[PDB]
Design a protein around this motif. Structure first.
Motif, PDB file in Angstrom:
ATOM      1  N   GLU A   1      -5.726   6.412   2.181  1.00 27.36           N
ATOM      2  CA  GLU A   1      -7.005   5.952   1.817  1.00 27.36           C
ATOM      3  C   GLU A   1      -7.158   5.124   0.526  1.00 27.36           C
ATOM      4  OE1 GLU A   1      -9.688   9.429   2.190  1.00 27.36           O
ATOM      5  OE2 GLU A   1      -9.110   9.423   4.481  1.00 27.36           O
ATOM      6  N   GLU A   2      -6.514   5.585  -0.605  1.00 25.01           N
ATOM      7  CA  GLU A   2      -6.205   4.700  -1.553  1.00 25.01           C
ATOM      8  C   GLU A   2      -5.272   3.399  -1.287  1.00 25.01           C
ATOM      9  OE1 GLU A   2      -7.919   4.643  -4.453  1.00 25.01           O
ATOM     10  OE2 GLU A   2      -6.363   3.196  -5.402  1.00 25.01           O
ATOM     11  N   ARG A   3      -5.031   2.947  -0.323  1.00 26.05           N
ATOM     12  CA  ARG A   3      -4.462   1.696   0.105  1.00 26.05           C
ATOM     13  C   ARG A   3      -5.310   0.871   1.156  1.00 26.05           C
ATOM     14  NH1 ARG A   3       0.787   4.765   1.610  1.00 26.05           N
ATOM     15  NH2 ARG A   3       1.474   2.899   2.356  1.00 26.05           N
ATOM     16  N   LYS A   4      -6.085   1.637   1.940  1.00 27.34           N
ATOM     17  CA  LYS A   4      -7.050   0.976   2.531  1.00 27.34           C
ATOM     18  C   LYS A   4      -8.088   0.363   1.749  1.00 27.34           C
ATOM     19  CE  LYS A   4      -6.576   2.426   7.563  1.00 27.34           C
ATOM     20  NZ  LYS A   4      -7.031   2.822   8.753  1.00 27.34           N
ATOM     21  N   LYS A   5      -8.660   1.345   0.785  1.00 28.10           N
ATOM     22  CA  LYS A   5      -9.300   0.903  -0.336  1.00 28.10           C
ATOM     23  C   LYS A   5      -8.193   0.158  -1.310  1.00 28.10           C
ATOM     24  CE  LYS A   5     -12.378   3.413  -2.561  1.00 28.10           C
ATOM     25  NZ  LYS A   5     -13.668   2.408  -2.181  1.00 28.10           N
ATOM     26  N   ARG A   6      -8.512  -0.960  -1.719  1.00 30.64           N
ATOM     27  CA  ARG A   6      -7.642  -2.028  -2.346  1.00 30.64           C
ATOM     28  C   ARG A   6      -6.924  -2.886  -1.274  1.00 30.64           C
ATOM     29  NH1 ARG A   6      -3.828  -0.567  -5.190  1.00 30.64           N
ATOM     30  NH2 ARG A   6      -3.525   1.451  -4.179  1.00 30.64           N
ATOM     31  N   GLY A   7      -7.299  -2.974  -0.058  1.00 29.79           N
ATOM     32  CA  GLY A   7      -7.019  -3.924   0.714  1.00 29.79           C
ATOM     33  C   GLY A   7      -5.721  -4.201   1.691  1.00 29.79           C
ATOM     34  N   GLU A   8      -4.838  -2.821   1.645  1.00 25.22           N
ATOM     35  CA  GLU A   8      -3.970  -2.810   2.668  1.00 25.22           C
ATOM     36  C   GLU A   8      -4.261  -2.417   4.173  1.00 25.22           C
ATOM     37  OE1 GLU A   8      -0.153  -3.620   2.397  1.00 25.22           O
ATOM     38  OE2 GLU A   8      -1.411  -3.717   4.357  1.00 25.22           O
ATOM     39  N   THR A   9      -4.056  -2.955   5.268  1.00 21.71           N
ATOM     40  CA  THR A   9      -4.388  -2.862   6.542  1.00 21.71           C
ATOM     41  C   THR A   9      -3.279  -2.517   7.684  1.00 21.71           C
ATOM     42  OG1 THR A   9      -6.171  -3.304   8.043  1.00 21.71           O
ATOM     43  CG2 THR A   9      -4.676  -5.299   7.213  1.00 21.71           C
ATOM     44  N   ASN A  10      -1.957  -2.755   7.165  1.00 20.31           N
ATOM     45  CA  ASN A  10      -0.809  -2.693   7.995  1.00 20.31           C
ATOM     46  C   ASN A  10      -0.583  -1.395   8.595  1.00 20.31           C
ATOM     47  OD1 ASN A  10       1.858  -2.591   8.929  1.00 20.31           O
ATOM     48  ND2 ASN A  10       2.325  -4.161   7.406  1.00 20.31           N
ATOM     49  N   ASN A  11      -1.158  -0.861   9.747  1.00 18.95           N
ATOM     50  CA  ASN A  11      -1.009   0.297  10.393  1.00 18.95           C
ATOM     51  C   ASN A  11       0.572   0.748  10.605  1.00 18.95           C
ATOM     52  OD1 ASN A  11      -3.649   1.220  10.640  1.00 18.95           O
ATOM     53  ND2 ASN A  11      -4.119  -0.414  12.242  1.00 18.95           N
ATOM     54  N   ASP A  12       1.410  -0.183  10.802  1.00 23.33           N
ATOM     55  CA  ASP A  12       2.724   0.295  11.047  1.00 23.33           C
ATOM     56  C   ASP A  12       3.433   0.629   9.618  1.00 23.33           C
ATOM     57  OD1 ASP A  12       2.239  -0.822  13.594  1.00 23.33           O
ATOM     58  OD2 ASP A  12       2.849  -2.881  13.155  1.00 23.33           O
ATOM     59  N   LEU A  13       2.967   0.240   8.634  1.00 27.10           N
ATOM     60  CA  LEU A  13       3.234   0.764   7.387  1.00 27.10           C
ATOM     61  C   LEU A  13       2.958   2.346   7.122  1.00 27.10           C
ATOM     62  CD1 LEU A  13       4.303   0.644   4.420  1.00 27.10           C
ATOM     63  CD2 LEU A  13       2.578  -0.888   3.820  1.00 27.10           C
ATOM     64  N   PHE A  14       1.447   2.581   7.607  1.00 24.47           N
ATOM     65  CA  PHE A  14       0.861   3.617   7.469  1.00 24.47           C
ATOM     66  C   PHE A  14       1.606   5.129   8.319  1.00 24.47           C
ATOM     67  CE2 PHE A  14      -3.278   1.315   6.448  1.00 24.47           C
ATOM     68  CZ  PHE A  14      -2.996   0.977   5.166  1.00 24.47           C
ATOM     69  N   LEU A  15       1.984   4.463   9.403  1.00 22.39           N
ATOM     70  CA  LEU A  15       2.493   5.576  10.337  1.00 22.39           C
ATOM     71  C   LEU A  15       4.006   5.757   9.809  1.00 22.39           C
ATOM     72  CD1 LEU A  15       2.595   7.192  12.937  1.00 22.39           C
ATOM     73  CD2 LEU A  15       3.440   4.994  14.282  1.00 22.39           C
ATOM     74  N   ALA A  16       4.681   4.763   9.263  1.00 25.04           N
ATOM     75  CA  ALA A  16       6.206   4.725   8.823  1.00 25.04           C
ATOM     76  C   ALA A  16       6.054   5.894   7.756  1.00 25.04           C
ATOM     77  CB  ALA A  16       6.592   3.343   8.057  1.00 25.04           C
ATOM     78  N   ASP A  17       4.944   5.631   6.755  1.00 26.30           N
ATOM     79  CA  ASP A  17       4.873   7.017   5.826  1.00 26.30           C
ATOM     80  C   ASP A  17       4.429   8.446   6.340  1.00 26.30           C
ATOM     81  OD1 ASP A  17       5.271   5.052   3.536  1.00 26.30           O
ATOM     82  OD2 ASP A  17       2.982   5.116   3.310  1.00 26.30           O
ATOM     83  N   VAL A  18       4.017   8.423   7.356  1.00 28.56           N
ATOM     84  CA  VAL A  18       3.471   9.749   8.220  1.00 28.56           C
ATOM     85  C   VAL A  18       5.008  10.046   8.671  1.00 28.56           C
ATOM     86  CG1 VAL A  18       2.527  10.838  10.126  1.00 28.56           C
ATOM     87  CG2 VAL A  18       1.104   9.435   8.496  1.00 28.56           C
TER      88      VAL A  18
END
Lengths: 907, 702
Positions: free
Chosen positions: B644-661
């Motif tokens: 959420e602290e990266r969706k805020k401040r303009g990230e949107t790459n869902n594949d990067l978010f699933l990689a972290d999970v």
């Protein structure tokens, strides 16, 4: 045999070797009283022999052959072979005499207080009877001239008396001494010569019965016959031949076990050995206990049922006894079940020990409990059919499978339930979410291939066997079945085919398998441990190639055991108040413990104190479950404290385990050693831990590294206090936002020195509103949503709460064309309110739906009065058509009233 | 109250008395000059037993089921084995009248014109003891200790088991009011005595009674019935009649009375002597009405020789609202049960209870000749202090009854009436077909909606403040049962072909149907979920997914939160829903926002965690945040707060978010593919370099 386990825990030896005639144990306050020859009376009390009080009592003139307790009032009653009757009271810590009595004629043969403790019945040998109040005042007294009594009991309600008769005959009276009938003594079929009542005991039901209409009344005779009735004239009682000379009988306090004290001729001698035999209310034999001495005189259970006092040859022995509780552990819930004073159900309690919550489930006819992972099975008698109530760790039933066999023995597995009678076994495969092959049934003398997903041949289950089942177990890889011959059968899983038959020199009391499914830990009927390596090749003394090896291991008084879940050679095993953990065949240091082996994984054994829980099952405490660390873990925790975090890692690099890397990591974090903590998280592959040490390793402030690392363990209250002490109220609120404590978020925002952010008070209120609304507490949700400006769920609440004044003052507050007005308008339509729906469709600037609503609710005046639209003339044609249809129904008065509502006053 | 003729026969002669084997398997009848033996299942007459010369005026049968006694105008008494042979004849002073075995000792009595003949089993003598009067009828006390005798002289007298006479009562008028039968109430501890079993010659020649609990039913030909203690004291008052009664009698339970007579019927009564109904009415005088052992069957004998065997059916009467099950107890009381707090209250009427209805703060009860309105005195949802609000002294005919805030609603057989409290009619509606079902569906006080189902299959909504009935739907078959979902958007209907059909009300369209249903309810809070019962199963269905089926008998009355208020044949049972099962049906469909609504009613921490990580991997961070807050696992809350602290401040790459999970879950090779494909191979190099997995790390330089 199948049942509980027991052993001789204590002795007390009496001065001059004075022989005891009788003993009985108080249950409301726990005193023992024992009566011997030469006027001996003593009161004794145990505490934690090392007894805490020991008072002899004086006044009797011969052997004190009756001793008996009032429970409800603080009174001991006693009489001797010289007929002095005494009632003692505990005054200033001493048993003093309160009342004294003597008939001056005959031996007092027996007594009983009634089930309420308000009356005593006293029965002489010559024929007299007395009934007296707890006041000591005599009520009535017969003389039953013709026969000599020798025994007495009340009935559960105190309406009926049983008198025995010394010629082995029993007569039933009302509580006024009016003879009702002779009792049927059906266990005395095929008998010769004289008979004598060895004892009668009736469980008055105070803890609830084992089942509704269970046997309650036990009778036994000097020839060793025993008879257990449902009520005083049950003419089809349970029949038992004990095969021994009986001296007396006693129910345990819960009425779930009958103990029978006697002696048997020894197998190679013209000499008798003292034994207690334990029986179910249904006459199945739970076990036999030997005792040393000339004769066992008398028998009595402790009020908790965890000891039984045995008066033997001027000694009192105490057998400790470890109940076979209906219990099991699943996913950090303990399941324990008990009969109730005030229900026919078992009160099953699912105690979530992780959150500390009780979920309580009243179950009819509970046969057993069993667990594997997150699921348990309550096996029960259906209201023959039986039902396996598969259930989760908070006690909500998932899939009650009905089966046509008695579930005597049950084994559970991460995919399977196995249930078995004495002759056949049923396997059910289960999960939570093809279905057809998921149930099967097999006879114990059958030789199945494994191959067939066949239909349930319940007709095979009644074929008689010479060697029945006595224990089973399963491992997710094999099912092991133990016969009464000492034959053990190995079957495959998930499909059931017979792999091999083994034979052994013992019957199995219990069976359990290591996770690798190659070592079987067998406990004999005699309470002796052995390991059997199922796969092991052996050259026999004949040279023949045998499979299955009896290992050299032996231990005694084993009754609870657990192979570790993770490791194939770690094992744990109770003896008495000691647990002897093993690695391979080699025992560790014994651990001091009473409780049952609950779970074994990650180098820890959880233990549970069921014996404390079941004294007050409605108020259990955290302390009734205890965690043990096996020696490799305690040595590593000791090194970290002694040798220190730096060099303690060398022992773990010498002998690694994934549990020990985590211990070094959490130690290194708490002492802020981010380098060693990083290596410890690497060695157990914890990427969450690696990221966490790196994040700490970027922070500037040691106080902040403390606040953050305190958070890691779950010490959130301490982290919050640390942030408040740091003047970081913002990080305190940040931690509470992450944890979801929105009441605390709002409490900090209200109590802080700074002006609280408006959008954050809005977020806080709306999340508390959501917290209650998601829990269906709409009236609570409104209190927050009205502060948090959440009109779009404040509407849902005022509708579910049925507050149409609330929902009106909501819709009247909104802007015109606001997105919520058309849904509040539909709420007023679904409930039948025209003016409110018209108001909402006018604020929504949505006028066609207002007209249509006036039409739908038959407000034809208001439907046509919206004169701004052409549709008014068009609906005048619909009004005419509707009136024509009422006139086809010939409803001319309704067409007149409809035309009056239309303002069609001419028509 | 309902009664059904199970079988009938007619003898050659009048039928004088009746006996049952204690297990209920055989019936024996004193018809004319022989005994007749009958099967109670279907009335086949097995044998005419022949022993007597003249009129068999009675028969009675001992509690052990081995022996029965029969008495004749030829002065004989015969003891018959249950082998149907007459092993011990006896011969009294005059004609026999009634005979009765003792409940406890099997001691017999045998009454005659002056003399009553007690004896205990196979002793060599009989106490032919004398009486002032013709000894019409005899009955042993429930504990066996006194034999009470009724006289043609209008006296009842009480004799001990030895034959001494201890107490007398005279009916005022004496021989004007002959005592033609009396019965001690079965209601004491001794009724289970002899309830546990699995097993021709001639015979020659008492204090503190007020503390003895027994009660005696007296039926006299002064045409009155009254109840009496062993102390001789009358209980209450004489329950008057308009006939010559005979054979006042009880079921095994001791709570309901049968009463035959010159009313030529078998009337049914409470143990207080209030009338409850009518078992089958008869061509001729009724001499005998015997309830079957252990059961609700009745058998009757009449002056014309008819024997009739009846089953009494005792229908269920109740109503539920949201969480307050009100139901009929005895046939004169309502028990009202708060289903959340498990509180009960008893309200006692003084008549039969015929209909019950309940709604928020309002309870209504219909008796034979009045209707009662009851009110909770507080707005507290835990209150149970019902007071009678109003009492309408008017008789009604009805098919169905319901109650609203200010009104009683009566369904007459094709017509719906709204009556005010205080009985004044407000409005009425006439349907196009016979009404089969009604429910109140809530509303503001005085405009409440009613939901109505007709035999033609039409379904209507009717507002109590409106003169016109609103068509919701029409169906191809009659409405058997009917319910609305929590929002009022959806309908469930049972179609009288044992199927459940489910409809949208706002669009008037079928959603789905199920082929086996008898009763149905929506969950009162959780919309899109319902429960039904049918064919021996309970059936829970969520949102057009498959249905959870488990064995049950009984019917769904309502459904709230995690509990379904199923009704067993006499009492509410409160079954619990497996919430974990519908929750995983939403998660198979990746409906995380919906799955949380099933979970939130109560599921395990394992269910919450498995929901939370499905939401996290589904990138539903608002659901996952809440699903983990229930478990309170800060590790993944810190990760969600990062994303959420990266969706805020303009990230949107869902594949990067699933990689972290997948990195936090230890799904390393899948995280690495996502770090590659998201465009960030250096993050996969860092992950494996940090894990010191150098055999995989080498790939990600480039």
């Amino acid at each position: 045999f199948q049942g509980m386990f027991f052993y001789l825990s204590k002795k007390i030896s009496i001065p001059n070797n004075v022989k005891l005639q009788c003993v009985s144990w108080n249950k409301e306050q726990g005193f023992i009283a024992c009566g011997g020859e030469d006027g001996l009376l003593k009161v004794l009390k145990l505490e934690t022999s090392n007894l805490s009080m020991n008072q002899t009592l004086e006044g009797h003139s011969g052997s004190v052959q009756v001793v008996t307790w009032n429970e409800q009032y603080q009174k001991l009653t006693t009489s001797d072979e010289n007929g002095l009757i005494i009632v003692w009271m505990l005054y200033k810590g001493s048993w003093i005499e309160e009342m004294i009595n003597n008939r001056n004629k005959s031996v007092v043969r027996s007594m009983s207080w009634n089930a309420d403790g308000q009356k005593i019945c006293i029965v002489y040998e010559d024929g007299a009877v007395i009934v007296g109040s707890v006041d000591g005042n005599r009520i009535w007294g017969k003389d039953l001239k013709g026969i000599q009594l020798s025994h007495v009991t009340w009935s559960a309600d105190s309406k009926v008396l049983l008198f025995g008769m010394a010629n082995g005959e029993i007569h039933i009276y009302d509580n006024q001494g009016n003879f009702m009938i002779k009792m049927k003594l059906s266990c005395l079929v095929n008998v010769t010569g004289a008979i004598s009542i060895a004892g009668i005991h009736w469980y008055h039901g105070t803890e609830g019965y084992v089942e509704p209409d269970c046997p309650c009344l036990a009778v036994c005779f000097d020839n060793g016959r025993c008879q257990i009735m449902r009520h005083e004239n049950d003419q089809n009682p349970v029949l038992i031949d004990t095969g021994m000379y009986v001296v007396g009988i006693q129910w345990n306090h819960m009425g779930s076990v009958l103990a029978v004290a006697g002696f048997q001729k020894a197998a190679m001698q013209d000499k008798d050995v003292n034994i207690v035999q334990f029986y179910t209310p249904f006459g199945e034999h739970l076990g036999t206990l030997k005792v040393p001495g000339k004769e066992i005189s008398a028998l009595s259970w402790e009020g908790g049922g965890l000891k039984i006092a045995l008066a033997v040859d001027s000694f009192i022995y105490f057998a400790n006894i470890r109940p076979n509780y209906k219990w099991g552990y699943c996913s950090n819930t303990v399941v324990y079940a008990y009969t109730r004073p005030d229900r026919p159900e078992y009160c099953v309690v699912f105690w979530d020990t992780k959150n500390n919550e009780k979920y309580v489930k009243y179950v009819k006819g509970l046969i057993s409990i069993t667990t594997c992972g997150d699921f348990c099975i309550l096996a029960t008698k259906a209201d023959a059919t039986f039902v396996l109530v598969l259930c989760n760790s908070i006690g909500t039933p998932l899939d009650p499978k009905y089966i046509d066999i008695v579930p005597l023995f049950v084994a559970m597995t991460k995919t399977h339930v196995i249930a078995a009678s004495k002759e056949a076994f049923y396997t059910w495969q289960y999960r939570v979410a093809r279905k057809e092959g998921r149930e099967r049934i097999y006879h114990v003398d059958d030789t199945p291939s494994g191959s067939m997903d066949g239909v349930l041949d319940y007709s095979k289950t009644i074929q008689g066997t010479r060697d029945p089942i006595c224990a089973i177990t399963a491992s997710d890889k094999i099912l092991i079945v133990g016969r009464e011959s000492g034959t053990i059968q190995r079957y495959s899983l998930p499909n059931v085919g017979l792999i091999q038959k083994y034979s052994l020199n013992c019957r199995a009391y219990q069976l359990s398998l290591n996770c690798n499914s190659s070592r079987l830990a067998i406990i004999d009927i005699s309470g002796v441990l052995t390991f059997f390596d199922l796969d092991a090749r052996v050259t026999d003394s004949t040279g023949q190639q045998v499979v299955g090896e009896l290992l050299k291991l032996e231990r005694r008084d084993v009754w609870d055991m657990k192979w570790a879940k993770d490791n194939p050679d770690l094992f744990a095993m109770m003896e008495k108040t000691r647990m002897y953990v093993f690695r391979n065949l080699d025992p560790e240091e014994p651990i001091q413990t009473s409780g049952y082996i609950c779970n074994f994984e990650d180098l820890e054994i959880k233990s549970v104190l069921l014996d404390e829980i079941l004294k007050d099952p409605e108020h259990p405490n955290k302390d009734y479950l205890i965690n043990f660390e096996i020696r490799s873990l305690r040595d590593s925790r000791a090194l970290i404290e002694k040798v220190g975090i730096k060099d303690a890692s060398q022992f773990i690099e010498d002998n690694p385990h994934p549990r020990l890397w985590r211990l070094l990591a959490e130690a290194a974090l708490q002492k802020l050693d981010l380098y060693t903590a990083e290596q410890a998280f690497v060695r157990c592959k914890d990427y969450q831990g690696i990221k966490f040490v790196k994040r700490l390793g970027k922070l500037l402030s040691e106080s902040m590294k403390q606040a953050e690392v305190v958070g890691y363990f779950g010490r959130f209250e301490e982290a919050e206090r640390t942030y408040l002490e740091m003047d970081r109220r913002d990080l305190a609120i940040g931690l509470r936002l992450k944890l979801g404590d929105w009441f605390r978020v709002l409490q900090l925002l209200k109590t802080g020195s700074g002006d609280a952010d408006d959008s954050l008070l809005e977020q806080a209120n709306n999340a508390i509103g959501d917290y209650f609304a998601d829990r269906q507490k709409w009236l609570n949700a409104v209190q927050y949503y009205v502060q948090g400006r959440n009109q779009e769920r404040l509407a849902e609440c005022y509708y579910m709460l049925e507050d149409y004044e609330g929902l009106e003052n909501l819709a009247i507050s909104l802007p015109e064309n606001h997105k919520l007005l058309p849904e509040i308008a539909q709420m007023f339509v679904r409930v039948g309110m025209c003016e409110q729906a018209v108001t909402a469709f006018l604020k929504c600037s949505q006028p066609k739906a207002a007209v249509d609503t006036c039409v739908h609710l038959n407000q034809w005046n208001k439907a046509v009065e919206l004169a701004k639209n052409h549709s008014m003339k068009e609906i005048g044609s619909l009004l005419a058509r509707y009136a024509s249809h009422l006139l086809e129904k010939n409803k001319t008065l309704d067409a007149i009233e409809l035309y009056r509502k239309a303002n069609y006053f001419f028509d | 109250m309902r009664a059904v003729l199970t079988w009938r026969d007619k003898a050659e002669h009048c039928i004088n008395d009746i006996a049952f084997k204690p297990d209920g398997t055989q019936l024996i009848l004193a018809a004319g000059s022989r005994l007749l033996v009958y099967d109670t299942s279907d009335g086949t007459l097995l044998q005419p037993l022949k022993g007597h010369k003249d009129t068999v005026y009675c028969v009675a049968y001992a509690k052990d089921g081995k022996r029965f006694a029969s008495g004749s105008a030829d002065k004989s008494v015969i003891i018959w084995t249950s082998k149907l042979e007459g092993i011990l004849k006896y011969t009294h002073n005059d004609a026999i009248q009634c005979v009765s075995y003792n409940p406890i000792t099997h001691q017999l009595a045998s009454c005659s014109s002056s003399d009553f003949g007690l004896w205990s089993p196979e002793q060599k003598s009989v106490s032919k003891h004398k009486s002032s009067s013709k000894i019409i009828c005899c009955s042993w006390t429930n504990d066996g200790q006194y034999l009470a005798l009724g006289m043609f002289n209008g006296i009842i007298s009480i004799r001990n088991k030895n034959g001494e006479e201890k107490v007398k009562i005279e009916r005022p008028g004496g021989s004007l009011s002959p005592i033609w039968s009396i019965c001690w109430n079965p209601s004491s501890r001794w009724e289970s005595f002899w309830m546990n079993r699995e097993n021709x010659x001639x015979x020659x020649x008492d204090d503190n009674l007020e503390e003895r609990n027994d009660i005696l039913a007296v039926a006299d030909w002064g045409q009155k019935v009254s109840f009496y203690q062993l102390s001789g004291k009358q209980i209450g008052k004489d329950r008057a009649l308009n006939f010559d009664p005979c054979c006042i009698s009880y079921f095994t339970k001791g709570e309901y009375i049968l009463l035959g007579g010159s009313d030529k019927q078998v009337s049914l009564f409470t143990k207080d002597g209030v009338r409850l109904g009518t078992v089958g009415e008869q061509n001729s005088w009724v001499w005998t009405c015997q309830a079957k052992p252990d059961s609700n069957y009745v058998v009757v004998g009449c002056q014309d020789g008819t024997i009739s065997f009846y089953q009494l059916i005792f229908s269920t009467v109740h109503g539920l609202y949201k969480d307050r099950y009100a139901y009929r107890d005895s046939m004169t009381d309502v028990i009202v049960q708060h289903l959340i707090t498990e509180q009960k209250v008893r309200i006692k009427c003084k008549e039969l209870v015929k209909k019950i209805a309940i709604y928020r703060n309002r309870l209504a009860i219909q008796l034979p000749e009045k209707i009662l309105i009851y009110e909770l005195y507080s707005e507290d949802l835990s209150d149970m202090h019902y007071r009678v609000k109003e009492k309408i002294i008017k008789k009604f005919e009805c098919n169905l009854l319901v109650v609203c805030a200010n009104h009683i609603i009566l369904c007459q057989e094709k017509r719906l009436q709204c009556l005010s409290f205080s009985g004044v009619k407000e409005r009425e509606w006439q349907m196009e077909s016979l009404i089969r079902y009604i429910k109140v569906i809530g509303g503001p006080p005085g405009r409440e909606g009613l939901l109505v189902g007709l035999k033609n299959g039409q379904i209507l909504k009717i507002f109590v403040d409106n003169l016109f009935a609103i068509v919701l739907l029409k169906q191809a078959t009659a409405v058997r049962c009917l319910d609305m979902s929590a929002s009022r958007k959806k309908l469930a209907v049972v179609d009288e072909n044992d199927t459940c059909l489910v409809y949208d009300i706002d669009t008037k369209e079928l959603l789905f149907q199920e082929p086996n249903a008898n009763s149905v309810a929506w969950n009162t809070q959780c919309e899109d979920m319902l429960c039904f019962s049918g064919g021996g199963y309970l059936n829970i269905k969520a949102s057009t997914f498959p249905v959870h089926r488990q064995k049950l008998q009984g019917f769904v009355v309502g459904y709230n939160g995690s509990k379904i208020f199923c009704l067993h044949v006499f009492s509410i049972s409160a079954v619990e829903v497996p919430q974990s099962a519908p929750m995983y049906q939403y998660l198979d469909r990746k409906l995380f926002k919906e799955a949380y609504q099933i979970a939130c009613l109560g599921v395990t921490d394992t269910d919450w965690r498995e929901l939370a990580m499905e939401a996290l991997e589904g990138l539903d961070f608002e659901t996952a945040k809440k699903a983990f807050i229930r478990v309170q696992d800060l590790r993944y809350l810190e990760l969600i707060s990062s994303i959420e602290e990266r969706k805020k401040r303009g990230e949107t790459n869902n594949d990067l978010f699933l990689a972290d999970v997948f990195s936090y879950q230890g799904k390393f090779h899948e995280a690495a593919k996502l770090y590659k494909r998201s465009g960030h191979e250096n993050l996969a190099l860092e992950m494996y370099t940090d894990l010191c997995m150098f055999e995989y790390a080498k790939d990600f330089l480039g």
